[PDB]
């Protein structure tokens, strides 16, 4: 998220065994980090 000029990240890590989909059942993401960057954002791009 990018709100009131801060960019925030939340994240979670889980080992799984479902062959080609997103899992059933519940988990919540703890906050990872917060960045006071003050930049506009409209698009994004993954890296392999």
């Amino acid at each position: 998220k990018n709100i009131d000029g801060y960019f925030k990240i939340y994240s979670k890590h889980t080992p799984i065994n479902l062959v080609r989909g997103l899992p059933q059942g519940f988990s919540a993401l703890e906050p990872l980090v917060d960045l006071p960057i003050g930049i506009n954002i409209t698009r994004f791009q993954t890296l392999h």
Partner: protein, 48 residues
Amino acid sequence: CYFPLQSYGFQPTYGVGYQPYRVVVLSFELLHAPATVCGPKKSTNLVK
């Protein structure tokens, strides 16, 4: 025709005001983006 610079030539014999000084200007901007340099926050011993 003039070269737009002129040199110093600081010698240890020069008088006060005519000697070399090292100078800093401290400058800052306010409220245009989120506050990201600030003074240290003093603290007191914990009471229970």
